[PDB]
Design a protein around this ligand. Structure first.
Ligand SMILES: O=C(O)c1cncc(O)c1
Length: 167
């Protein structure tokens, strides 16, 4: 049993809810929250900007030190950093950004990072301002992630469309 409440079960291991991931992280304090990161860990907008704002910019300060030491992530890659006041850990995952021309096939590689963690609170990778079709992102998630994933979809309209269209 875990602390996640009000989710809709899609599969054996994937659950979904209409929720602000920031508000959900603050309530649950999950072991892992996933950030919709870019390779530079520049948390300017969407999930990353909202998560970073909720940490009072401590996520960005930590991220800048990580990049100064290690250089940029790969598209499809990830790193584990602090979850600050939101979670134990933040798994920063880089899905491909369609608005930068990145290979959508990298979305499966991005989701494979989730399999290193038994339970996660996450957004749909490459959705929102990353430009991918969220229906596609949910299908790749279900077909890739084997660990237990609790998806927080920000848009009520989109949430209802994801549920209604789910095969
Ligand atoms: O994860 C989301 O629900 C999301 C919704 N809108 C914009 C965005 O970048 C992400």
């Amino acid at each position: 049993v875990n602390s996640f409440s009000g989710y809709l079960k899609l599969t054996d291991n994937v659950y979904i809810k209409n929720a602000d991931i920031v508000e959900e992280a603050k309530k649950v304090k999950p072991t892992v929250v996933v950030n919709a990161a870019n390779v530079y860990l520049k948390h300017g907008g969407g999930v990353a900007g909202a998560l970073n704002k909720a940490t009072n910019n401590a996520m960005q300060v930590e991220s800048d030190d990580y990049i100064a030491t290690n250089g940029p992530l790969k598209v499809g890659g990830s790193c584990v950093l602090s979850g600050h006041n939101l979670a134990k850990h933040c798994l920063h995952v880089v899905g491909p950004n369609v608005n930068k021309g990145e290979d959508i096939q990298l979305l499966k590689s991005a989701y494979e990072n989730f399999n290193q963690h038994e339970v996660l609170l996450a957004p749909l990778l490459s959705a929102g301002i990353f430009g991918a079709d969220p229906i596609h992102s949910l299908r790749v998630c279900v077909d890739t992630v084997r660990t237990n994933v609790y998806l927080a979809v920000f848009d009520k309209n989109l949430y209802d469309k994801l549920v209604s269209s789910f095969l």
